[PDB]
């Protein structure tokens, strides 16, 4: 859990820079945020 | 900044020297300096705070001098001095706490915490008493460019790096050649490992070399070099490069033969130690090259011959280690140690008053990511905050 507490949006896994990896892994779920309506833009 | 150090030094010497019963012949000069400070201060309004949880305090200085009428001191003098000193003291502490939490990539040396800017003027220059401290002496020097140096005990110049390098590998990780290393703080524990014990190599010898490139030069370093690195010398289950699979490591230690430790500078060698263990010196060095070997024992008793067969299984893995601790050193730049608390003061002030990350220092001021990229901006800002932290710790430890 890269964060305050455990959040499924912030659970890095399947890692086959550390911060770069964490950011990419967290960004691979914002594609789901997009079709989950928690966005603001285009 | 020099006037701030002078404020702190004279307030300290006032809290110390100006005590009941003492003699005016010991505090005449300090009383004149205190009175001059009060004169040069009276008539100015300072503001401190406005970032994070720091509260916006206002300082208005209207104080009175000290009458040079006595020979010995009495409580009616000491109490006046103390009720004039506590105000200046908490003022300096709040100034320092407002100055440690500010950053800038553009002229970091140039002051922040605008009360301190106001103090950097020319109407305040009559407050200077003595710039005796190491940090402030080096500050004055660097301003009037000269060869400086901070003396460090067990400096934390190495960022934490624990990692391996495999020059011979397979998916099964059954016959490996490589080197593991842990560079932490002041210590380097390096260890080369061959699973064949150099049966296939020329003259039954396998080389290993570790190259550590510091970010800042050091000088007059005293170093303790020993064999048999302790943390890479017991069984282990290590991860692959890609973090998917794992592999086992059952080490058996041997001694480094033809060991060679070279302290270099700009690629030119400076110091070279061949087969000397224990305490050694390095007059100037930016790069360290530790080059050792694993030499198969030509004569083996049965107990050890049973561990190094001529076939691939290799259930015991020959290793060769080296521990290197930098005990003392002297650096033209500022770092952390195991002796001084300035870094702790700074990080504690920030973690207490909840400062947003600035454009220079990384989040939480993690020394690892702060010394991995020791940019000149970071160096200047770290020097400034360490200096004012020293100035604050001279009053409130």
């Amino acid at each position: 859990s890269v964060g305050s507490s455990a959040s499924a949006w912030t659970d890095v896994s399947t890692q086959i820079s550390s911060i770069s990896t964490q950011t990419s892994t967290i960004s691979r779920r914002l594609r789901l945020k997009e079709m989950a309506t928690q966005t603001e833009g285009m | 900044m020099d006037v701030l150090y002078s404020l702190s030094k004279t307030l300290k010497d006032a809290r110390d020297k100006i005590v009941e019963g003492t003699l005016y012949s010991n505090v005449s000069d300090l009383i004149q300096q205190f009175n001059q400070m009060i004169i040069t201060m009276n008539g100015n309004e300072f503001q401190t705070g406005g970032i994070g949880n720091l509260p916006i305090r206002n300082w208005n200085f209207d104080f009175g001098l000290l009458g040079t009428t006595l020979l010995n001191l009495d409580a009616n003098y000491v109490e006046t001095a103390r009720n004039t000193i506590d105000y200046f003291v908490d003022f300096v502490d709040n100034v320092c706490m407002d100055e440690m939490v500010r950053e800038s990539q553009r002229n970091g040396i140039a002051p922040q915490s605008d009360s301190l800017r106001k103090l950097s003027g020319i109407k305040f220059k009559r407050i200077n008493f003595d710039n005796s401290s190491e940090y402030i002496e080096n500050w004055n020097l660097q301003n009037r460019r000269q060869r400086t140096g901070f003396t460090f005990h067990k400096p934390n110049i190495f960022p934490y790096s624990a990692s391996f390098t495999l020059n011979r590998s397979q998916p099964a990780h059954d016959n490996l050649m490589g080197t593991m290393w842990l560079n932490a703080g002041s210590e380097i524990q390096v260890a080369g490992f061959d699973y064949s014990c150099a049966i296939n190599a020329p003259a039954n010898i396998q080389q290993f070399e570790h190259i550590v490139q510091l970010r800042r030069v050091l000088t007059t370093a005293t170093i303790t070099l020993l064999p048999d690195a302790e943390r890479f010398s017991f069984p282990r289950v290590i991860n692959s490069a890609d973090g998917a699979t794992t592999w086992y490591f059952n080490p058996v230690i041997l001694r480094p033969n033809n060991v060679e430790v070279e302290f270099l500078l700009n690629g030119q060698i400076i110091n070279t130690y061949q087969a000397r263990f224990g305490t050694i010196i390095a007059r100037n060095f930016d790069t360290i090259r530790l080059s050792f070997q694993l030499m198969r024992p030509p004569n083996m008793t049965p107990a050890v011959a049973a561990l190094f067969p001529n076939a691939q299984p290799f259930e015991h893995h020959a290793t060769v280690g080296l521990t290197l601790r930098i005990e003392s050193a002297v650096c033209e730049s500022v770092l952390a140690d195991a002796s001084k608390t300035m870094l702790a003061n700074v990080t504690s002030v920030r973690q207490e008053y909840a400062i947003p990350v600035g454009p220079v220092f990384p989040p939480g001021m993690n020394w690892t990511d702060l010394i991995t990229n020791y940019s000149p901006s970071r160096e200047d800002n770290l020097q400034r905050v360490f200096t004012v932290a020293s100035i604050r710790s001279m009053l409130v430890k």
């Binding site: 890095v12 086959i16 550390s18 | 990692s163 397979q170 998916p171 099964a172 059954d174 076939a311």
Partner: protein, 265 residues
């Protein structure tokens, strides 16, 4: 994507353990069992293959990834074993009369050999290092060797009278010959029936797993008589039936695939 080079690798100790590759390699790979005709005989069921495939289906392997490949006898399998899969399991019966044969089979399939050809008629060969051996296959091999001295003459044998030679093999389907490394040898071999290759032993083949269904561990993979090792992919079992053996394999296949690792070559 460089090939045919060895470059330094790097890593760290802060990386986290990734999710498991089992249940993905089980789909993107293949499994191949080798069983003896005795098992199919004792069983007498024409659907045991589909039964075992449907059982593997629970353990993860899909239906068209598992293969069963029969073999009449240890020697008839040792004759040119062409293993081409991603995870190979071999079942092997214990027979004191076949100790060396089924140890040579292990030393052949478990290890990875770099094999050049041999011209008995013309050349007189020698072994350079402790890992260059001469492996011969065929229906029945009869090998006879004669060492030579410094001046190309025999040592206890005559270069013309073949009978004087020393007999290392007698009617064997597979032979692995290690001779004194550093002296030129002449050979006589019935090349009509058998082919002999000069091979060099390399790192192990992590793709095959031998399972001795019977008596005590006798397999000496390494030819030096000091190691006598027992490896991870060298298993033993006690048996009175075969359905129980195959159920054991199916229930502990994940352990087998954990003890095995896909090839590097």
């Amino acid at each position: 994507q460089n090939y045919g080079i060895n470059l330094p690798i790097t890593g760290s100790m802060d990386t986290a353990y990734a999710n498991s590759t089992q249940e993905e390699t089980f789909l993107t790979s293949t499994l191949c069992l080798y069983y003896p005709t005795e098992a199919a005989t004792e069983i007498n069921d024409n659907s045991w293959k589909d039964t075992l495939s449907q059982l593997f289906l629970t353990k993860g392997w899909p239906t068209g990834s598992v293969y069963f490949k029969e073999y009449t006898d240890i020697a008839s399998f040792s004759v040119d074993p062409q293993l081409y899969c991603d995870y190979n399991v071999v079942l092997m019966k214990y027979d004191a009369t076949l100790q060396l044969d089924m140890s040579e089979l292990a030393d052949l399939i478990l290890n990875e050999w770099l094999c050049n050809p041999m011209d008995i008629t013309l050349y007189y060969y020698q072994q350079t290092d402790e890992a260059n051996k001469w492996i011969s296959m065929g229906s029945s091999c009869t090998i006879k060797v004669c060492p030579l001295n410094t001046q190309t003459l025999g040592i206890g044998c005559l270069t013309t009278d073949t009978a004087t030679f020393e007999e290392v093999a007698t009617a064997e389907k597979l032979v692995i010959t290690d001779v004194v490394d550093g002296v030129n040898h002449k050979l006589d071999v019935t090349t009509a029936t058998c082919t002999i290759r000069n091979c060099k032993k390399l790192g192990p083949r992590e793709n095959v797993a031998v399972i001795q269904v019977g008596g005590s561990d006798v397999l000496d993979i390494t030819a030096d008589p000091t190691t006598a090792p027992q490896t991870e992919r060298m298993m033993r079992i006690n048996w009175k039936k075969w359905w129980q053996v195959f159920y054991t394999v199916v229930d502990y296949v994940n352990q087998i695939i954990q003890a095995m690792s896909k090839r590097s070559r």
